[PDB]
Symmetry: D3
Subunit: 250 residues, 6 copies
């Protein structure tokens, strides 16, 4: 292995410069199966890597795990191995009333409610997505025909207090995050997730291209629990979009 | 006499216009408006000069903001009250990357917030990001007229001198916070310096308004009078062509 | 010209070391007319410059515009040309019930609700006026006989949200500035304006003398819309004080 | 399941109130095997859970993954299920010249170079370990006879820039973290890891008991590559200490 | 004198490496009297210094005054003279309902509501007590038989607004501290005092050992017992010093 | 016996006094009070010593604050509760400008806030500014007795050592934040270092109380590190005469 965590060599990639980066290790195979000649490379901790082919060109699929810290490890080590373009796909909870479950969201930039992004750039630096990657995702969503929303995402280091959840062990939220959801809502923020602030900041400040797409599985203004059947269809919809976007970026 | 506090305009003056081009210089307002059909002056107060014109049978507004976030925030807020929903900024800039030449055109995706006024609308963690439709329109308009274009991040400062790390000043010193800042921005891939985009993009993105940013390079910090005039005409043609696609 | 923005040479000043700095470019001609031998020097962007004579000594009047950014340009370039003393004249809105419309205010120091001051000194540094300039303004106010208050001013980078105005397009104020006016009121702050924080900080941290005087045109506890008759008389009253103060500082 | 991520019910725990929380899902079986009646419960994403018995009392072992974010999900959902005491075991890189590879470190408190801790308490709040937990670990290390150091730990949201590593894709470190290692060294900080700031802050501010122990696999002042032989013995040493400390806290 | 403020030479210490550091200059004699052969060395400003014998070993008692600033002067100058272990004793106001007047509190670490700690380490650094010192204080509390609580302390640069007191001249508390007591209460913070954050931070970041113990004289949620509580706590800090010689 | 928590004073003890001179050293209180008519000792508790005197037929208070903002904030609050409305501080200082000499007098217009206590009264953006009437009286009194006076900005630190960039210490190190800080304040025109002005001026200006600050230079940091004990004695007596004369103008 040429790297500390992923368990991969330069030869394993076979000249790949683009990677799709989901959060769940168990979802890596499903994405790679949509492309040609899928093969397993490695699995260590939360990092599972598969290789595939797209229009005769090698492509990587690699899981990051939950959160900025493990995402920062995966992105750095993939960059060392030659990756220059990163496309993230994940699940999300919407905070706007007009956004429904099953909708697809493309992130232009993120609210930095994380710690890892500060290790690459000061807070004043924008957590902005690459223009070519964002274009490819919006065009891919229109190609397959989905309800799409484009805008700002709130990216939090926690699932609970940072997203103003009160049904917890303590039942309390620290002063800084008290009434924060209502503030983001008024500012036009679409949704909550946990990795995009880190990914977009670290790529934009290091000459790497990054894009972000997500499927809505819950709306915070309507309900609190997701549905099992609709989630699988929504995940399938978002996967098709990210693969189609990767096609345009090769 | 007036519906607003500073601009001196009524809703009737706009004639249903929802788009506005916002330069910094009051003197350059006439020049932009003359490129479009039926140009007419409306008001001239302080640093704010407003002109109305017609683009493809649709009314468009041109209004100067002056230098800096404070007066930009006054102009944008008062124009939004009058019915404007789309704002397109055009200005001059100094490039900090060696590959970007004088005469090049730059489109801003988002800005580094080295200003104060942006914080009056959203906390620092909120991204000073441009609208996707506006950015697309500006990029496609630049390709239409044929120009050397660079797309990326811009540093937006509340000063011209210390915040942009200039040492040829009265004091000859730069405060600790900004010492070595230019080298840091350069390493992070930041294209250029200007003085208004962070305020404009933050206030628009956090209030449901569409904003875009385009600039012409007149100097490179790592390295002519007539070349500055040609660069302005090149950039002005792009912002008008982009406005056509957004109507 | 020897400067980037103002369009002036060192010769145009003719040995001048003091400058009166208003905000409105249209007000420059009125202030210069009060002094002997007025002449137009330059007009570029928001910067209009006039040269006059006071007691046989050359004096400059130069507009800064609204806000710290353009003010920082004007002051720096004037300092390069030889100016060592700066006196600001402007309008203001009072936040104290005991201060009435028509009163004159002299600022000792300012609350830094701006960005430009930070480009010259860290936040812990006081935005304080020069003692000789402040004494000259107070004694000039007593010379003409006007109701004067001396104290602290809040200096904001915006006209609307930073001064807690809710009659706007969005009708919202960001968390940081919510309830800020009530806090400044309890702390004894007299008024709101938009330039003093930048001017006083940049001068005090660079060895330049600076003073600040203002006329109250509106009271926030009483009304919102100003007048026409009383505004003109207050602006004529305050201008007299700033010229009289310049006589003492020459 | 009673929770969102772990895939566990309250009855699965069988009355357990203590959990050992490693980072690596693969290390869970190895810790559980030291105790009586070890059995698998669930495996979802980076969260693997096993149940065992210690002196006739049920105990839980659950993986957190790398980083504060996934750690915060695991700790919260375990607290919902009845866990009140948390003991972390991990690997670390030492930054003091007097600490040898193979040594064991017990953390009294942590430097907060993370984001997640801020979602529970403001920066001024100490990321401090529980006194009873710290005592148990120190006495357990004395029991088996290991070389032990007790003190402060630096806890970072990144593996690379936040720990001032320069052998990377960019080869640069952001201004904030430039020269930071030398600063921590002078302040007597022992080591770098990635989860203790989150764990200790979130427990101390919510009435939960937490302790932290680690085995040194590399010294940053000596070499940059860990020895893949003594590492197995070091991790075996640290596991024995955490299990013996758990015995004392039942 | 070998120092700027304290008025002491290295010879005055007679080889002492441990110091008990109260806030009150008038309480220095009272603490020393519990040990053998106490003698006054110096009295300058708010710094009163006595030396005594404990189990045949010399021990220093030196007042710091109220607040981080004067504390930082005393600790630094004592370190120059050879002191390596510092044990603080004081009074406190509890903010938890379960802690009674007369109880004894041992601080593991402190909430940094002070300015002086920042002059030694950035805010992210923990104001944590030394493990050996904390252990000795807990064991000494059991030795005399007190009702003891161990945990986190809020350390403030003011007595009034920083501790959310509204019975003042202004009757107001700045926004930053409005509702702060309730927040600390929910986070399990035991009490308020004015020096621990400075002491613990400056010692932990400079290789010096420090411990903190206090007697509860008032409960914020709720003369006679005030003197008894102080006598109880002083006995503990001297007994703790015995185990650290 | 006492109307306050710390000072050990009743409102009746003040006899109608509204002005207080506030030094740092408890042992310097008697020296200032001896300059005025009918001096009497009221109380001595902790670092707080209080004397009462008469000035031009009007009662005046002298009360020590101790070193640092924390104890200063206690003294000021409890004196205000007893009716004091005007505060004048006197102390010793170390100059950081080459042109300021030992024996000079400094009057502070406003202070750089390198303290913690000031934040408990107003956010950092609020200026630590002195009262205009108090400042005017201090400058005029200095010219009255004839002294070399400088008016400007003071750096007010929560420590004596690292916050004032002293390296001759036990550790020999200064935290990143304050490394190179003295050179920065020097370039910005800051006159000197002391330890209480930021707290005093902020808390008074934000609560409707009048405050003034004056100090005597006993050391210059660019010239030396250890003050001459003979010159300190003379400078102290010089500064005390000014603060009493300034108090006369404000009654
Ligand atoms: O609100 C959310 N915030 C987020 O940050 N994310 C993104 O994934 C983070 C790790 O789960 C996310 O996705 C959601 C949506 C959501 C709501 C409730 C419970 C969720 O979790 C797992 C689960 C439990 C039961 C059935 C299906 C899924 C997810
Ligand atoms: O470096 C820059 N930073 C900027 O923020 N801007 C943007 O305009 C801000 C107000 O001028 C900007 O454009 C430049 C480029 C530049 C370099 C040197 C001098 C400049 O000033 C005005 C000028 C001087 C002489 C002839 C024409 C214009 C502008
Ligand atoms: O509340 C104020 N805050 C301020 O910061 N300033 C200072 O001028 C900033 C530039 O406008 C200021 O002056 C005022 C008073 C005021 C209130 C309402 C409208 C104002 O604007 C211009 C106007 C409109 C209608 C009639 C006369 C003047 C000014
Ligand atoms: O310096 C460190 N910082 C840390 O934060 N951690 C803690 O684990 C975090 C996830 O690896 C940790 O442990 C170390 C020690 C270290 C140094 C170099 C490479 C390392 O990585 C994995 C590995 C690769 C090859 C052989 C053994 C271990 C670990
Ligand atoms: O609430 C407190 N906060 C604290 O920071 N401290 C610590 O001592 C700091 C200086 O008193 C502390 O101890 C207390 C307890 C307390 C409450 C009310 C009055 C107090 O003051 C002195 C006094 C007044 C009247 C009778 C006896 C003692 C002390
Ligand atoms: O540099 C200084 N910074 C200050 O903050 N102060 C103000 O007094 C604070 C408590 O000493 C202050 O005064 C000085 C001048 C100074 C320098 C070295 C030693 C000093 O202390 C007492 C002393 C010791 C030996 C001979 C004479 C005086 C005072
Ligand atoms: K993870
Ligand atoms: K302007
Ligand atoms: K003190």
């Amino acid at each position: 292995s040429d790297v500390f965590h992923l368990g991969l060599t330069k030869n394993d990639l076979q000249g790949a410069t683009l990677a799709i980066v989901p959060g769940d290790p168990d979802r890596v195979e499903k994405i790679a199966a949509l492309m040609d000649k899928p093969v397993k490379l490695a699995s260590h901790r939360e990092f599972t890597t598969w290789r595939a082919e797209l229009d005769g060109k090698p492509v990587i699929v690699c899981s990051t795990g939950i959160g900025g810290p493990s995402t920062s490890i995966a992105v750095e080590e993939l960059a060392q191995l030659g990756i220059r373009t990163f496309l993230r796909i994940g699940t999300t909870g919407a905070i706007q009333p007009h956004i429904n479950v099953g909708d697809v969201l493309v992130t232009t930039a993120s609210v930095r409610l994380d710690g890892a992004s500060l290790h690459f750039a000061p807070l004043e630096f924008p957590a902005v997505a690459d223009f070519e990657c964002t274009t490819a995702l919006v065009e891919a969503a229109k190609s397959i025909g989905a309800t799409t929303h484009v805008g700002v995402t709130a990216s939090s280091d926690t699932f609970y207090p940072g997203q103003e959840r009160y049904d917890t062990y303590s039942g309390r939220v620290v002063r800084h995050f008290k009434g924060s959801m209502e503030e983001w809502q008024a500012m036009g923020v679409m949704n909550y997730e946990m990795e995009s602030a880190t990914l977009l900041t670290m790529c934009a400040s290091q000459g790497l291209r990054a894009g972000m797409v997500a499927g809505v599985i819950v709306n915070r203004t309507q309900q609190e629990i997701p549905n099992a059947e609709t989630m699988k269809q929504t995940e399938s919809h978002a996967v098709k979009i990210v693969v189609e976007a990767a096609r345009r970026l090769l």
